[model samples]
Target: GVQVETISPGDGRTFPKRGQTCVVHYTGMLEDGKKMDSSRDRNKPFKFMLGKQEVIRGWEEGVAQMSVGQRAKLTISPDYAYGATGHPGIIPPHATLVFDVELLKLE
Candidate 1:
């Protein structure tokens, strides 16, 4: 499973529904505080369709709880991330990942 902690309340009206597209910015790191990935670093937000399996399970579940313009911290267990296989040269096996995710838009 994943743990969610809200950082910002967001607009408070618009929520993403399944089949809708979501654009977000995220900074991902390891439990040891090692940097892994960040859409913000690239100056580009990630776009994915909700419930589409286009991203990690943790992202799907965690982001679903957020409204537009919301920011939150997501602690993702390996079971919901890369699993035991992990991302080669990036994440370690059985690692717990953390991401500061901000929902920019829903369309």
Candidate 2:
């Protein structure tokens, strides 16, 4: 469903417990490496409840293991991403997505 590559490990020993809220900065890209969206461009972090299905399946799995300050690249298959119906004009059908993500905080 998703593959993860840690670019840099997080500091300390803190990992989010289930149901905790996590904030992240991410840049999402298409299979060909074209950027689709980014939190940095908007100057805001994306927040969601861990394990709550608030985001994509790939993000749920990828972010669940991340500690605060960790950076990773996630390659997600269509089934774990937007699937065949993808996000209208931004993402194509059955697209394989990539995301460079940094966990900013966990609360």
Candidate 3:
């Protein structure tokens, strides 16, 4: 399961649909606050086709729930993330991933 905390919430009139393209800025980390990745730090947004497993399950479903220009904190359980056997050497097993995900574009 995933939990979402909307920060900006956007206009509420521009939610993305499945298979559309989306751009986002995100910071991914474990429950212990050990940072794993951040698009914001790179100063570049990550873009992918929505609903396509181009990202983790949490991001696929969670990002679809957002509107354009929305900023959210997403808490993703292991099942929705890398699962019981998370990313080798990057994330620990059964880790819960926390992300500051901001929806930048819906196209």
Candidate 4:
């Protein structure tokens, strides 16, 4: 069994920390574990700037504490995710989300 833990306590200050960028592989799902998206199937990782507001709060927060090659399963509340206006086609409003994420690289 592989257990994932949060090494950096997220106080909402860890992520989106200015100019850092991170590359990651991720599988996103509903709280029920029903998958909605994944980078693995695409055979590529997703890259984005940390704290850049390009993504949701949860992802911004989750990626900050990660080291290269670290993996984590994140459970994100609506407040930390898409919020009240959730992604139109994929995520529903006020829904909780889950993500299995791997930190592959950072710059």
Candidate 5:
């Protein structure tokens, strides 16, 4: 038998769903665990609507698995993250990304 603890009831949201939006604060690190970006430093969070393609594929998919106030550590492969043409300077081409994210809100 499988047991599950439902911390919060489902809000009718799930991964990869279209039109779902979420606000999150995150720290992105490279494969060597070197920090790349952090919303904490900016003193502001990032917000994106799911399936909108406003961000990398991994972010969109990973954030979709969260609920309001949930925290997650997402390990993304290069295929699901920034591909060959990565963010100039900040991220290298074909680099993998590790994200520590806190979901603030979902709407």
Candidate 6:
């Protein structure tokens, strides 16, 4: 239920209240620094409509409080993330996840 924001300045700039959309660039990893996912080389951004179950709780909560062009490194707890039944094998159950994120846009 906790997320830490770091100022690394997305494009430096959400509750995505209503019909607004949020766009972001992000990388996800484990506490042990294990890399899992990223959109940096996607050649495009990840777009999602707010409050539409577009993503996980951590993602929503992280970008929700951010502004456009702002970058954040969110360390999220399990419940607020993938939860207990998260990925197996590589991903730990009830594990904490870390996201190196860039808030690219909100519309």
C-alpha TM-scores of all predictions = 0.91, 0.89, 0.93, 0.80, 0.77, 0.83
Name the regions of candidate 6 deviating beyond 4 angstroms.
9-15
The lDDT for every candidate, in the order shown, is 0.90, 0.87, 0.86, 0.74, 0.72, 0.77
By summed lDDT, the worst window of 10 consecutive residues in model 2 runs over 11-20
Once fitted onto the true fold, the runs of candidate 1 whose alpha carbons sit more than 4 angstroms away are none
Clashing pairs in 6: 10-69, 10-70, 10-71, 11-69, 12-69, 12-70, 13-67, 13-68, 13-69, 13-70
Put down candidate 3 lDDT per residue, 1-107, tens digits, no spaces: 78988988787889888878898999987876668789978899899997677989887788878888899988899999989888798777898988889999987
Q: Which residue pairs in candidate 3 collide?
A: none
Q: Which is better, 1 or 3, measured by lDDT?
A: 1
Highest TM-score, which number?
Answer: 3
Model 5, 49: alpha-carbon shift in Å?
A: 0.8
* Model 5 whole-model lDDT (C-alpha atoms): 0.72
What is the Å distance of residue 71 in model 5 from its true position? 0.6
Collision count of model 1: 0
lDDT measured at residue 45 in model 3 versus the true structure, 0 to 100: 89
CA RMSD of all predictions: 1.3, 1.5, 1.1, 5.7, 5.6, 2.4
- Tens-digit lDDT track for model 1 on 37-72? 899888999999987799999988999989898999
Cand. 4 TM to true fold:
0.80
Ranking by lDDT: 1, 2, 3, 6, 4, 5
Candidate 6 per-residue C-alpha lDDT over 49-107 given as tens digits, one digit per residue, 9 for 90 to 100: 87688787887787777767788788889998778887777666888988888877677
What's the TM for model 6?
0.83
At residue 35, what lDDT does model 5 achieve?
A: 91
lDDT of 6: 0.77
